[PDB]
Amino acid sequence: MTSISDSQIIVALVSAFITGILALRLGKSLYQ
């Protein structure tokens, strides 16, 4: 019986932000 903690949501959001930064870098490399 589990329900996902709030700190887990914080970790997921931070990881998503880092992945978005990486995607921005890749898109910039593709454009240039």
Partner 1 sequence: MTASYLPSIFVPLIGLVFPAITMASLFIYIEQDE
Partner 2 sequence: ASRFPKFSRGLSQDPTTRRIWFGIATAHDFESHDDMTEERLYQKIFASHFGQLAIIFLWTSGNLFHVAWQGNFEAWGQDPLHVRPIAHAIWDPHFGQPAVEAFTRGGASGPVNIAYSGVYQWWYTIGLRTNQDLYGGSIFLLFVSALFLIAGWLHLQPKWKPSVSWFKNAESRLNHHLSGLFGVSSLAWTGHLVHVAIPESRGEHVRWNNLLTALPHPQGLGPFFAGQWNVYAQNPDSNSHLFGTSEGAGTAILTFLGGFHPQTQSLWLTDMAHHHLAIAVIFIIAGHMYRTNFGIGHSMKEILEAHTPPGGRLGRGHKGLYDTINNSLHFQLGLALASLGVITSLVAQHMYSLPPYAFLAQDFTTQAALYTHHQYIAGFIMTGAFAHGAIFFIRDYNPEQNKDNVLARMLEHKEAIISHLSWASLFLGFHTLGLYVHNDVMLAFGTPEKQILIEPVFAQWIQSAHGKALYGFDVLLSSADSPAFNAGQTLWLPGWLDAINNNSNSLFLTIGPGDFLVHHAIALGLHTTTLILVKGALDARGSKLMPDKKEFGYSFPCDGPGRGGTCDISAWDAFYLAVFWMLNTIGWVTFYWHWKHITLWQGNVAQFNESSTYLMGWLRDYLWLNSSQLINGYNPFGMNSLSVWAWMFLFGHLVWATGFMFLISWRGYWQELIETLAWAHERTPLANLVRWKDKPVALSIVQARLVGLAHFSVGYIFTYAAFLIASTSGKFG
Q: Is 4 in the site for partner 2 (CB under 8 A)?
A: yes
Q: How many CA atoms lie within 13 A of 22 on its CB side?
A: 6
Q: How many CA atoms lie within 13 A of 29 on its CB side?
A: 6
- As measured in angstroms, the least distance from the Cβ of 31 to partner 2 is 8
Q: Does 18 bind ligand CLA (CB under 6 A)?
A: no
For position 22 contacting ligand CLA by CB under 6 A, the verdict is no
Q: Does residue 3 belong to the site contacting partner 1 (CB under 8 A)?
A: yes
Distance CA 14, CA 32 (A): 27
Q: How many residues bind partner 1, per CB under 8 A?
A: 6
